[PDB]
Amino acid sequence: SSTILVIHGPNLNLLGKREPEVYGHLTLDNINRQLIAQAEQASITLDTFQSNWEGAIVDRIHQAQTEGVKLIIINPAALTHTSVALRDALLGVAIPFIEVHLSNVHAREAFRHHSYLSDKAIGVICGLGAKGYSFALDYAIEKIQ
Amino acid sequence: SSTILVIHGPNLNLLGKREPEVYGHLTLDNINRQLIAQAEQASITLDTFQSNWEGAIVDRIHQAQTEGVKLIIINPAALTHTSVALRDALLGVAIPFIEVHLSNVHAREAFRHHSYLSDKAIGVICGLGAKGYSFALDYAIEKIQ
Amino acid sequence: SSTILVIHGPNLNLLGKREPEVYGHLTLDNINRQLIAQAEQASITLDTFQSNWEGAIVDRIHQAQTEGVKLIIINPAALTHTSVALRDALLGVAIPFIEVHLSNVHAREAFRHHSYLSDKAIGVICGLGAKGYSFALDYAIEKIQ
Amino acid sequence: SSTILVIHGPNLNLLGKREPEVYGHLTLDNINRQLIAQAEQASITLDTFQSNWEGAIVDRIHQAQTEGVKLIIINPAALTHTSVALRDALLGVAIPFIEVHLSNVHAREAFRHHSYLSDKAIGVICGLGAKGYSFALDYAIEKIQ
Amino acid sequence: SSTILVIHGPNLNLLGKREPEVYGHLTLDNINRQLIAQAEQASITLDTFQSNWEGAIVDRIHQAQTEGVKLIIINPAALTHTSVALRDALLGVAIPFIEVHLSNVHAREAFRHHSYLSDKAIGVICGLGAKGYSFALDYAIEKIQ
Amino acid sequence: SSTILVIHGPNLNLLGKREPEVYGHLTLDNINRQLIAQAEQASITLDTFQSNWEGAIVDRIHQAQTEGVKLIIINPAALTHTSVALRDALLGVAIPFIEVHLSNVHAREAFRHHSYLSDKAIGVICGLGAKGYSFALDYAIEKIQ
Amino acid sequence: SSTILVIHGPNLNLLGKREPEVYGHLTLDNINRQLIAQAEQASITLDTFQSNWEGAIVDRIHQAQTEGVKLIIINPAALTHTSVALRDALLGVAIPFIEVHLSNVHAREAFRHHSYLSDKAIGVICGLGAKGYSFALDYAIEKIQ
Amino acid sequence: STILVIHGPNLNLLGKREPEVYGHLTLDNINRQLIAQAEQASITLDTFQSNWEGAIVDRIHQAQTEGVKLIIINPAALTHTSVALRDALLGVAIPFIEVHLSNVHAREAFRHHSYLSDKAIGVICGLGAKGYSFALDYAIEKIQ
Amino acid sequence: SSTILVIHGPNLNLLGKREPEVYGHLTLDNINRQLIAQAEQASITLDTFQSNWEGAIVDRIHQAQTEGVKLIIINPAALTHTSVALRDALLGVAIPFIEVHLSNVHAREAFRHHSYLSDKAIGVICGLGAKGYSFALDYAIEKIQ
Amino acid sequence: SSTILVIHGPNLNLLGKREPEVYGHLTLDNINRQLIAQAEQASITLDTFQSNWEGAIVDRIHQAQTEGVKLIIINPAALTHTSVALRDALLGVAIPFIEVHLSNVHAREAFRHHSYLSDKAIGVICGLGAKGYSFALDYAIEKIQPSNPN
Amino acid sequence: SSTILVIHGPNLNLLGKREPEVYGHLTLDNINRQLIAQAEQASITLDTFQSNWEGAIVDRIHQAQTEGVKLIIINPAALTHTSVALRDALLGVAIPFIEVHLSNVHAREAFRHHSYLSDKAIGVICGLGAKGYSFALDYAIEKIQ
Amino acid sequence: SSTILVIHGPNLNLLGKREPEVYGHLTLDNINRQLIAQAEQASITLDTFQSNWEGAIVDRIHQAQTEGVKLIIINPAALTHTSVALRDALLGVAIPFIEVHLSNVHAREAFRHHSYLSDKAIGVICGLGAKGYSFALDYAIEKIQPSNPN
């Protein structure tokens, strides 16, 4: 009834385009399907977005507050280290959000440790991969029941 | 003949999207219109542009070289801390400018103190809200006349 | 035994002692029972350990390797910012761990943004209260089966 | 009426010497008159202070309190980057104020990019010559209308 | 059976769009056609792209993996200092690339020294204007064999 | 009826081991007794505790809460620069504390300047030798009124 | 032949102005009036001094030298973080001083953490208020005797 | 004269995942050859390992009263974090040499920093357990 | 038909106030007649001036533009690392200067390694004690003509 | 008076010394004779130089001033990160120069991202192996043409 | 021709040049001799080289490859902090090395804490005087078996 | 009896070489007879040295120690910012030195503000053109008779 919104940042789109071994066989779609499925099983709405354009997401988020979204679960991808606009969009709207990362952002380049969201997020999950999204949703469904 | 171009960076359109409590409550246009009125009365022809997509903001800056725009007023907001490409635009066409900010950026988080445009612009204003926008237009003019 | 060991860093024994507002009421042993139940519903063993003495924790972490623990869910608390011993213990025993925190670590003093653990954990959940422990228990159980 | 004090930092008493093509036409006098004339238009008894001395300005700020001054407009800046005594007086009397710089102060040497006032100041103006004060004073008045 | 994509980033379209000594006659398209012919002379196919938009360049390089582009010659421009997206875009597809800038990155402001791609390209060529492209292409032609 | 607690950190038990060479013949035992007598002669009860283990001090701090201690006069000594656990212990039991140091800390190494306790202590006495304990006691007694 | 000279930095003249607790009723004179009193019952003389000018306190400290002041109790206020002149003044005349701050300096802005005087004072009291002066004086009595 | 060898936390793990990560060598092994090195030089050397700082602190206070002359310490992890260990060492004022099995400089930067190094007589890192012997050979030559 | 002013910053008047050296009796007094003499012996005009008051020193150089002058030799002392008011005071009058210091700036505390006057001076001199002044003067004299 | 001088810095002699692939088989010798052959078709005279001592490179640069070398193509190697002396030399003689590196320098240790040279060069090439030099040449060879006339 | 090659950097040739307990009478020669003696005990062939010219050291490292040296014990002295060319010659010939220093570098000045050679050496010794070269040889000797 | 050694770093040999309007024709050679005549005038022995090779300079600082040079005036040039090797050369020989730079190093790139020498130098003089050497020699000259006494 009250919407959850899952936002995917740049390049998440490329997910799965070179299996066998690089996490071969997993795609941004495979992911959207589970989350959508998990959100359904506990009777809640879930919309997924994706663009390699920062202006496209800032847009979506301005719409999310308008579309009544209650809690955003964002995988800002590379934009989390560079976009304060991605931050002032999620704050300016005042929606709660939980930041999600597939990879352990802390285990990669140091410029990846900085984030423009995690501090205003309810929480942050990184490195649990796809399930990160799942748990993020788990906490979200309860967060406001 | 002349043209002033006020551009607004991301999220600025969200002005007034939840009014209580006693905050301020004004929109992106309450100023756009506050400016255009002030523009013509002094014989100069204004122009405004707003997006959350950096590309757009660049092309509008570019096309200004074709157009013959003499000076720009801009509030890149979030972009001032992040886009040099934006910087490359205003220098690429040799169109002077001014940078304005609604909130007093220096009283917020630290990261908001850096600016990729401030140093190039004729000047900067912040913490006075919309009154800076229009304080700027005032200078834009007394320069051309 | 399919042992997973839950470790709680110092001061966590005080959770729930000015009930109404500060942290509210969720006692260490309240979290312990919860984990034990989840642990048993999955037919997976789970001992727990708390101590205000860092060395008690490292002692426990070693004992865990001896005991064949497959993964540690550690809530180092104040030690995530100050303990390399803790990091090197977990890397010494090569027991993969998930770092978990109740409060959103990135929301407090900048000094709590650093972790001598995070970069080498599988992932990090923070700011999601006791559930953090549970999700961590989920990912963990599903990684062992 | 009700008083606004317009404090000037050290060096603004200088002038426009080597006046043609040094950018030194107008003097402090020419800014202090213009403004006091603008406070006349606002029906406020606006007094000014220029001192190359810190201790004269702080003392001034305390007199201002006892004299129930309502808001201070202050162009420290050779004092903006260096003094907290100035800051602690402007807070210790809790009279609101604004910061103004004739030149764009971010277009210069990197160490001008910091201020001990800007953060606890209502707003900041830099870059637009002495037009900047008139902007401050205007604003200050609407702050009393 | 080979293709070379050439990518021009933001503000590269302005070459020769300001006449006299400001980049003179040489247009982005003169560069394009010469390169096209140099390609053809040695029976290689070659395409060119340019956009002030981050997402667009991001998108088209993904199109490249689909189109079988054996190597990208790219002049990111101002996006080398901001976009970790493009870094994940080029890294994502895995199309070896060459960094080309016309001007000399290092003779400028400190933030230009920082590149999100430099450390991942085959090599960089900056400071040699148009000819920079010809060379990259020359090398790109011999690379494939 | 009121209990004041005085907690001495690691290495403080060493007071009086090389008497004339460094500091003086004064001990923890004197400071303690003179402290008790001053409190008996003021109708306050007072207990004391010293330890070289963060856990014990942490532990004691927790018991002071249950014992109804009204205030802790503490000398964390070295823990002050490294223990965010000690900090969280005092925070977790919310017993006002005054941080005392016999030696003047800022006179020493740069790292001794940082402290995880000073910003949460009611006040800090450092460098005035053992009187800083009497003064803390004295102050704590006026506070106990 | 003992005199004690108490110095009060800029703004301390403002103590006890909005007595309805922006901070309490205790005024600068009260402090001196209780200080001179305490001294006498020990047959010690004691003049005191306050000022908002860097120079005044400097000159003043210089006079203490010729006046044969045994010790100095000083509260530099903000000059503590900005004046190396006050520093070189105190080290210049070499009268040991007890740096006293009514407020726990460490609980405020980062720039207040710094101090150009602490590494050079016998000790520091900060955050214990006016009793801090008596304590300084009490310590200052017995050491001088 | 008594040397006292302190091993910080986790050193009790030496040789516990034998396949060429570490190797077969253990801490008791190191102590064994160390006490031996000591007895060969007619020096009493006591060892102490604890994953507990207070234990290590107390030990060095006891070391004062016992009359210990020099401490060879491998604070391991405690190097980059414990100024209490520093103050304890400084407090009883017993000279010490800092030891580290792996080249700390070829790892993570936070490794690079030591709260003891500047006050130790010297430092040895990257030469494996051999460092205790070197430090002990040095320790011994400072007492004889 | 020129003139030369010499400036001394705070604390200099303290020279030679604790008998044997560390400058045993080279007071500031001495250093002035010495510098004055040398100027009256090559026939140049010049006055000396020392103040523990910043504003006074700043004032004093504005009197430099009122009367004369071609070159200024200055030892700010403590105001070198602190004052940018003094810097712009020199640039504004535009009188080229020579920076001088009695002790070796570079050999003291790090904080003293920063000079606000160094990068604009004609040149700097430090560590040559008194004699340093002597050279500054000397370089000027053979520079006017 | 229309020479091009090519300068190789420290360790560049070692090209192809380990024949098997830590790099290929290419030596400085080959790069030069190719450069010289290339300068001949254009009727341009070119010289080359290499040394592992900063001073010697500083000297040869200074010597190019007197030879009337018109443009210097330089691969400074490790020196770009440490030698402000090499820097003040190319600026000393005011000979434009192109900086070339065989490997992509930004793809390694942080310190290796700094350069006391790149900013004052005409352009920089890095990563392209030997061909990086050819481009410098082909570019230089034109460069002699424009910037007339007289 | 030689199995192990010791390198002594600039200024190590100064050892013992000021003998009466401005350090030990121990020369660089004595150190070479001691090492050589020791190497003859393990039937290892050792060569020594010292110079104040980086190029001579680099050329030597190059000659070292073509000679087939197995390990380099190097005390680059000063050059540890500044030479990447030494780095590049050592890596370039791909010969492993142990780094050595006589004094505790960590006890001296901060700029001495940095090293262009430490991270690629097998190990480093410092503070144990000449004994440090011994320990390294003894270490090298064992490895070459 | 009290000899002064003047050391000029790399590139200083280029002085007086795009003559018509830049700097002067004033050569390093020229600056040297000025210092020589200044030293000779005060009864002080003065030597000079310049090399574009650091190792040549460290060597000479070492020779100065055995030469009994009471004080060194050095224009480390670009080396003041890079050679801690030069710094340790000076500290190890424990010869007091004065640092001279022709230009005002603080008015140039940020990297020119860090000196591996200055904090151990008695003093620094920069910006005063070639006369800085003169003022340094000046101090050096009176600095050889001060309170021991005498």
Side-chain angles (χ1 to χ4, degrees), chain D residues 51 53-56 58-59 62 65-66 82-93 116 119-120, chain G residues 10-14 17-18 50-55 77-83 108-109 111-112 114:
Chain D
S51 180
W53 309 56
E54 170 136 300
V58 167
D59 260 5
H62 299 185
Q65 172 210 236
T66 34
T82 72
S83 161
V84 277
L86 199 78
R87 182 222 192 67
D88 284 350
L90 290 174
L91 285 170
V93 294
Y116 271 117
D119 64 316
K120 287 280 196 267
Chain G
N11 309 294
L12 275 313
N13 66 118
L14 310 177
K17 254 49 182 305
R18 252 61 211 175
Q50 180 289 319
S51 174
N52 322 271
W53 313 63
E54 208 160 335
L79 296 194
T80 185
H81 327 293
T82 59
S83 151
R108 334 259 305 275
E109 291 88 5
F111 68 77
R112 284 179 207 280
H114 179 46

Side-chain angles (χ1 to χ4, degrees), chain B residues 104-133:
Chain B
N104 177 19
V105 296
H106 312 299
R108 317 264 304 267
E109 288 98 311
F111 84 77
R112 294 186 197 278
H113 304 171
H114 158 58
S115 177
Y116 283 133
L117 288 64
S118 289
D119 79 297
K120 287 279 84 157
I122 304 169
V124 184
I125 295 186
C126 80
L128 309 185
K131 286 210 129 291
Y133 263 122

Side-chain angles (χ1 to χ4, degrees), chain B residues 104 106 124-128, chain D residues 98-101 118 121-126:
Chain B
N104 177 19
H106 312 299
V124 184
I125 295 186
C126 80
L128 309 185
Chain D
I98 297 124
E99 184 167 12
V100 172
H101 314 286
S118 317
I122 298 139
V124 173
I125 276 126
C126 91

Side-chain angles (χ1 to χ4, degrees), chain I residues 80-141:
Chain I
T80 309
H81 328 299
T82 234
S83 188
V84 33
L86 212 85
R87 172 196 167 89
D88 296 330
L90 296 151
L91 299 176
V93 287
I95 309 167
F97 62 93
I98 295 171
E99 178 164 357
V100 179
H101 292 285
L102 291 187
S103 69
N104 176 14
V105 156
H106 304 278
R108 325 284 296 293
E109 299 99 340
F111 78 73
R112 301 182 189 280
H113 295 172
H114 184 282
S115 149
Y116 277 129
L117 290 21
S118 293
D119 51 301
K120 284 292 177 215
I122 272 169
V124 196
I125 316 167
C126 53
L128 302 182
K131 294 310 211 80
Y133 285 119
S134 298
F135 319 141
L137 176 43
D138 206 287
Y139 169 99
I141 281 175

Side-chain angles (χ1 to χ4, degrees), chain I residues 7-24:
Chain I
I7 306 271
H8 301 238
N11 298 110
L12 258 356
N13 52 267
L14 273 214
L15 283 167
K17 234 106 290 261
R18 234 202 200 192
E19 353 109 315
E21 56 253 278
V22 236
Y23 256 162

Side-chain angles (χ1 to χ4, degrees), chain F residues 11 17 52-53 82 109 112, chain H residues 54 58 61 81 83 86-87:
Chain F
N11 315 309
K17 267 48 191 302
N52 304 322
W53 316 48
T82 59
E109 301 88 318
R112 281 193 208 287
Chain H
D58 280 355
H61 286 174
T81 67
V83 21
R86 180 192 184 89
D87 299 352

